Amino acid sequence: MELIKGQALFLELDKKDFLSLKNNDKNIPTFAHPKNQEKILAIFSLPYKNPPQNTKLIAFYKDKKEEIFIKTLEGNYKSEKLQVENKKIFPPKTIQERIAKELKEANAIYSSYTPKALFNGAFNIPLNSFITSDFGKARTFNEKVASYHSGTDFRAATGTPIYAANSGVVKIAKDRYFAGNSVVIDHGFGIYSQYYHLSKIDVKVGQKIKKGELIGLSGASGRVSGPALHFGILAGGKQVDPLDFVSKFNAIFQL
Numbered sequence: 176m177e178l179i180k181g182q183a184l185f186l187e188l189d190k191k192d193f194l195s196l197k198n199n200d201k202n203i204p205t206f207a208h209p210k211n212q213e214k215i216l217a218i219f220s221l222p223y224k225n226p227p228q229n230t231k232l233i234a235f236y237k238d239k240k241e242e243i244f245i246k247t248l249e250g251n252y253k254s255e256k257l258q259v260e261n262k263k264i265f266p267p268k269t270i271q272e273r274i275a276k277e278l279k280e281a282n283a284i285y286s287s288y289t290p291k292a293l294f295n296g297a298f299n300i301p302l303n304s305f306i307t308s309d310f311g312k313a314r315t316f317n318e319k320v321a322s323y324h325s326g327t328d329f330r331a332a333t334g335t336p337i338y339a340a341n342s343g344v345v346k347i348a349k350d351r352y353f354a355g356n357s358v359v360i361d362h363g364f365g366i367y368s369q370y371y372h373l374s375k376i377d378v379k380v381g382q383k384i385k386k387g388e389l390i391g392l393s394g395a396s397g398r399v400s401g402p403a404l405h406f407g408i409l410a411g412g413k414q415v416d417p418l419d420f421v422s423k424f425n426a427i428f429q430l
């Protein structure tokens with residue numbers, strides 16, 4: 176198979192005699208196929224930054240050991256080189272402490288895997304508006320990706336109501352340094368949706384939330400150039416193309 180870096184892919188495997196799915200040491204979790212009792216699914220994601228050229232996954236069965244090859248594609252992502260440099264980029268120490276703490280909290284959540292589905296049907300778009308900056312937009316320094324856009328921004332005037340893309344459990348609901356007012360929702364199976372730069376948060380950590388339900392109001396908080404809704408998905412432990420993923424997810428999970 177082939178996959179573009181920064182994308183997720185749904186793997187399908189036989190349910191019976193299946194013991195484990197591995198990439199090197201890493202176990203990859205599995206969940207039931209919703210429409211076929213003899214199948215299981217797994218999600219495999221490539222990082223945007225520093226992917227490997229190729230991936231060899233092994234699915235161990237009682238009497239059998241099948242292999243799976245996935246080649247990394249580049250995609251046609253938007254790319255802006257920086258040759259000028261002059262780089263330093265370090266802030267005060269209690270600000271770095273904030274950045275460090277919020278980062279380790281977020282990884283604790285993103286590492287984690289709820290082994291049941293908290294979602295309900297297909298994902299929705301968090302609001303009915305257009306994209307003003309797509310996932311994958313990169314900044315280059317020396318043929319290396321310095322940074323990239325880890326979600327997709329929708330046009331939204333400050334105060335634009337924002338709805339939950341799917342059901343789940345709210346895991347974050349506070350102002351953070353880079354993301355500003357942010358809500359992160361656990362949908363199960365290590366799938367997290369993200370809603371950043373909000374002007375107002377309408378949910379509490381731990382709170383169960385249904386697809387469609389209001390989560391807050393759009394805003395301009397955090398590292399942004401103006402008011403917009405930043406929408407991201409994390410799955411397979413990686414930030415992935417939000418709209419692509421929604422599209423792949425709904426193909427399996429409608430009804």
Ligand SMILES: CC(=O)N[C@@H](Cc1ccc(S(N)(=O)=O)cc1)C(=O)N[C@H](C)C(=O)NO
Pocket residue numbers: 277278281282324325326328351353354371397398399405
């Ligand atoms: C630490 C970092 O990498 N920040 C990046 C991406 C970013 C945001 C949030 C997070 S999390 N889930 O708290 O670890 C990681 C990475 C970033 O500046 N995103 C800005 C807010 C954006 O998207 N503007 O439209």
Ligand SMILES: [Zn+2]
Pocket residue numbers: 324325326327328405406
């Ligand atoms: Zn964004």
